Amino acid sequence: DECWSVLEGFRVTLTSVIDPSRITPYLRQCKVLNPDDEEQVLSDPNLVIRKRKVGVLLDILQRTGHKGYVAFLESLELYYPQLYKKVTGK
Amino acid sequence: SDYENDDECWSVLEGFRVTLTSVIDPSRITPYLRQCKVLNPDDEEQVLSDPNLVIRKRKVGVLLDILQRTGHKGYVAFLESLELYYPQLYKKVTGK
Structure with missing residues (x-):
């Protein structure tokens, strides 16, 4: 579907505000980030x-x-x- | 004789600080340190922010x-x- 492509217009806003370590634990528990993903983001x-x-x-x-x-x-x-x-x- | 007591143990690693801080990717060890009960979640967020x-x-x-x-x-x-x-x-x- 189109959910992510729709969100693209807000990419710079998202990347400017979010501190990823605040949300990766939630996303890991959602099983949408594997352990290698989280290590990659936080390295x-x-x-x-x-x-x-x-x-x-x-x-x-x-x-x-x-x-x-x-x-x-x-x-x-x-x-x-x-x-x-x-x-x-x- | 104890040369790494509660008072002095960290001072003995001082001479290696530059190397420790250059080699370690902290996100690789903070989960383990949290499991050892020496880091709180607030501490881990401070480190990784x-x-x-x-x-x-x-x-x-x-x-x-x-x-x-x-x-x-x-x-x-x-x-x-x-x-x-x-x-x-x-x-x-x-x-x-």
Whole structure:
């Protein structure tokens, strides 16, 4: 049908206002975004932007003390194994 | 002797900060960290939000293209998400 092509006139309005991370959880639960879709939308290919977001993440985790430190290292061992070895001396 | 106590553990990662922040794509690990109970949903939204319009616009464009490929089901779901989270946009694109 024609629903999406009709919405095209509003594309720039939509893209200017929406912060995608506010709606991707809803859309994932609707099963119209698969996990690879969401990872694609939310990923940060620009280094400057990525660095800022990781910095904010580290700051949030730091405020939880050792608990966040341990969970963070677990997350590296799972998703960034080479980074894990570098920061833990293994 | 403990050299990563609650007081000092983060300071030991300080020397790796530039590398950590350059290699990690945060959206890949925030779901796991939320399951470890060290990130609240509010924290995760702070991390993943995009304050730069140019970046936001690209990501929403990518999202819209993915949703368009799911046809009418994606359209209905998308409009519901606007009803809830962007009510003024919902009205605008539906004529209210």
